[model samples]
Target: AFNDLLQQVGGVGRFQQIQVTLVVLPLLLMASHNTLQNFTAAIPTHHCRPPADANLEVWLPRDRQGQPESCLRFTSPQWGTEPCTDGWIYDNSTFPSTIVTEWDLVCSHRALRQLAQSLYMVGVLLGAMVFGYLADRLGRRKVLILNYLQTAVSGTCAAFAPNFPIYCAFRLLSGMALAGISLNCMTLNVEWMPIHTRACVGTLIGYVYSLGQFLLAGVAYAVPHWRHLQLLVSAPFFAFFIYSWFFIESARWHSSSGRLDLTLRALQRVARINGKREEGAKLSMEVLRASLQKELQASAMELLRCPTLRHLFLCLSMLWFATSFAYYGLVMDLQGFGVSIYLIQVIFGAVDLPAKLVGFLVINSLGRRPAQMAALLLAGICILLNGVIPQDQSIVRTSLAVLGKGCLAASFNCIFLYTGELYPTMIRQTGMGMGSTMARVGSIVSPLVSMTAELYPSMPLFIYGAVPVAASAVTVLLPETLGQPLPDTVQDLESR
Candidate 1:
């Protein structure tokens, strides 16, 4: 009956169309922020500096192989060779400027280069906890608007940061905002959409993020100076903030919180946009309040307050970690694909589209469980295959990686839609928040785990492969929601 109201005014009418499209527009920038560090902290080739009058041979001593050492050099005053304490001769042809150049974090200060992403990722991690709770408490629209503004301002501050020390703080804040933006947008869109149309909504939203990589790759190429690139990636969010003012609050969010009057107003506004004002006007406060049983129940407590909500939280946490851990570790590490800024970036970007559409049709045909299960299983298999193959078979390994990435994207797409319906409308955003938190943790762990490659060349891929297959086993425990409507209450969870 709650859906009856949605169907009456229009399930995915003009009001819905404009809202989802606008919500996703900012996603393009969000994608750039995640991988922006690839260019920002990029290290270029360098040589130790010599006395002002000397040639390269003076500062750079030859090794046993007669290779000129870039990190340390023999100087007139040194016992043997000292580090490039004076300055470094840098290669500007590959990239014009970066933290590596600006701060000379190249050789001696190598750990500082990795520090930037950790600061940013940790910010995203904490933000998921902060804004995830806040979205439930403050309402979806308000939190999303705050995220847009914070990201816009913080990112700008990072771009203008006078020193690397100042840069970390703002970069961290910008990442925190990134978590909020992605979490809120997906939940807001899912709540607005009909159950049958949810796959389309989630997958389409993912496409903007996929497309954003191209935007990032192009801008990174054009603006080799890292500060300007960060500015360009961030400026759009400020525009998005201005644009988000036009966004309407989610009616479901209003109703779920039991603000009947506000919910009515939101619905009426949506109705007017869809040319169904009379339909909207008929549902008064009394009818709206009585229609949703869980809204009233939620007044006593939240999703975590109940037994069912906690179950969904754990399940989603496991699944979310797999998708994110795999995607971040695999996709972000373009080193295996020859580090072409847009080379494999271009290939994977195209690959994800077909993967998404295939998942779309498969979910539509078979249902959520099989789509999720198969996607994870197949991805794990491809990675496992890649690991066992000969290192000389680089082409096969690369092909398998492409195959695996496509599968992970599908797994990611299914989880988002499944997570939406898996939780009731009242708790949806917080559930997304919980998963977002797990995703951050997973991403952070991936690089740490990838370091296992130092032990056995194939060790990292095997470990990466192991988790998703296990996650597929975990998926078996999840309730199948093939054609279920959005649950309106904890009552709905018990019935399933």
Candidate 2:
């Protein structure tokens, strides 16, 4: 009987509703968030000039006389280094002021990036906690739309930030708003689907993220000005807010959150829209309560307490950590790679499109664990290869790095559903939120990783490559959810 009910829940039209929720909102938030960070490099922050005089000796070796012929020094216009002769400095007066070539601005002002990332992730962390809990407790439909509206508001504000400090502040708030949208959407969609459809839902949403990414690149191409490009990326989200009028909250979440009247209303709408008879559509309080009780008795902590879930969490978190680390690390360090920062970023945005295609194919055919582990391993190898190769081989190295990074990028969309599936319905979003926030912890550290790159350019990548490779090994231990029903309780998750 439960199996038959599960089939009905995962039926065609019901499935499409949850899939639409998953696709439209969260990926828009992701594209908006990533574009905000990537576009900042296009804003000018540094000043550069040739050495005071061409010191021939710095480039040329003396003859047998063992004497230097000439000397030269490069000086900063503003911030100075300890007799620092080579790197650029912060000079706000420069048109198109940028942080890329300005070592001091990039380094000294790294505090801003670090602080922004931390606060942003903290917002994300809290968002996940609150919205994830709300999705399970309040029902998916109510909280998902609310979260999307909140994210749209914050995103628009962040895009139009008048100053750097304000930009930093809004990004933080936007991150929180985005966090709720992503977590709730994932929970609602996965819960509404059957086991086979779960991976498909993940990939389908991935395509949306790719579309958003591709759109960002196109916008940046059209609006060369960084701030204007940000505004362009942001302006469309207002349209999403309108979606609230037509969008329904998740019926699955409604069923689980114990809102039978609303849940039945939602199901009635679904039945009516899908042309099902109304006679059997109503859900009684007792029935709803029983379903939720069965689900909640398998709370999140209970899943973690079980040996299998304990194993699952370790594998999933480690994989999440690795992917987040490498992906953010590469993105944060893009400016240092000696290319058009806009062009480089646009290239990244372009590359994001194929990642969805790859993720769709891989996660659907292969199990989540195998796909995740293989992708991480590949990303680690790419970063590793990029490191060992000489910088002079810029084109070759960059290609490998992009390819590897693309693989890791593909896994992020997969893991969203993967982590949620590892927990029971009651705590699914909680677990997803917590695990995702932990991944964001890696994102929070990304700028520091890049900033440290100044001290030793490859230090960050070396560490990033090594960590995720180890994490990928851990991913090998995770159980396959590709063919399993959504786990109902913590015990249900662990027992599997």
Candidate 3:
């Protein structure tokens, strides 16, 4: 009933587009924070300081690779060595200051620097479960404002943390807030749009995130200070708190919960903004009040109560995990390709915009399942090709890695839309939350998996590549939701 009213009010016109842009702005900052550590925790060239009694150049010994060792020193002519007893010296020409240099997180302390991201992912894991239920219970608009507040406040605190533990604590809160913002903003855009508009809206929102990445490269290059960059990214989220007031609560949500008066007003508000006051006046409160009156309490367990839904839930979880793992693994493992890390980072960010554009085109023409499967498979192939290519062929390897990043970027767009469509409105945010929780697992594991290069040069790529291939095969088992009305209730899923 509300959807029909929305159609009369101009379904995909000025009002919706304006709304999408407003809600999507926060995602830009979220993207920045998500990759903040890529530069902020970067380790530079370093070596142990020369002993006071020894010559500066002769104290350190070279290994078989003929480079001065960062962690070891020769104590005698017979190859007897000791760990760095004095301190270390770092080359600071590129990064002005990073966590690694500031905290001396090198050699034995290196993993501590990486631990910050893992801690943040832990917050994301918990926040997904918490906010998923709250958005449904309180309302998307309310929960989103809370998300904005948490992110801004925590991120600001993280920038000035006095120690590593304090910084990790602040990041944990920021990550939790970020999870809520990401899940709800995506869900809000999807729920507000009509089925036909979802593919474009979803893909465009993905493009905005890509644009954020593009801008982040410039921001990092200009600032070159981790604390300043952190402050820069965190400040924008405050504006979102003020912007939250303009958001209309989901009419579908109000109607589902039997809050008919609010539903009517929200629909009328959309109509009024779209210059369709007459159409707005035509909607009967009594009729809308009577529609979808069966109030189903939003529950995560409800997703598992049915056979088909259970199958969908499990498959989608796997897909979400694969998507997160592959995307971050590619992003964090950008080193060792014999190119400037900054240049490669910029190229990596730039490629995603085209990837999103291509995704929009392909999903529109071929439908969601095929587009999703094809993207994952292609991404897998590109990553696998990078693994097989010899490292000596640096140009070819970097090109393939960038190409694989683009494909994974496309896959990210596909999954966001596909998952939103697959779940019914009654549990959409909850479903997204569950998927995000699984994604956090993938994200937390990405750095650890990226470390596989220590064991074998190509091991990380092979692992990241193989998971997506498995996910693409699983994609074949799920149903298509293209051009279908957003399912209003679990009963909608049952009938399908």
- How close is every model to the real structure, measured as TM-score? 0.81, 0.74, 0.85
lDDT of 2 by residue, 1-496 (tens): 2223444432566435644763455475476465455654443433332345542224322345554212222233322113234544343442243223322334355456555655677677667777766766766666766666766676567656666677667767777767777765666666555656766766666667666765655665566554565556655556665655466666555555555666556655655555554433644556644654554334667547767666666677777777887888776655555565556666776676777678768888988778888778888898888888887787877787778768878778778867877777776655675577668777776666756665786787798899878988887677788989888865677677
TM-score of 3: 0.85
User: Which residue ranges in model 2 land beyond 4 Å of their true spot?
Assistant: 1-26, 43-45, 48-107, 137-139, 159-163, 188-196, 275-297, 303-308, 338-373, 413-434, 476-496
Better of 2 and 3 by TM-score: 3
- Pick by TM-score: which candidate is best? 3
- lDDT minimum window of 10 residues, candidate 3: 288-297
lDDT of 3 by residue, 116-205 (tens): 887888888878778877988988878999999899899999989889999999999999998888878877877778866755765667
Residue 312 shift from truth in candidate 1, angstroms: 8.5
How many angstroms is residue 336 displaced in model 1 relative to the true structure, after the best TM-score fit? 4.9
Candidate 1 runs further than 4 Å off: 51-58, 61-68, 75-80, 290-319, 358-397, 414-433, 448-496
lDDT of 1 at 355: 93
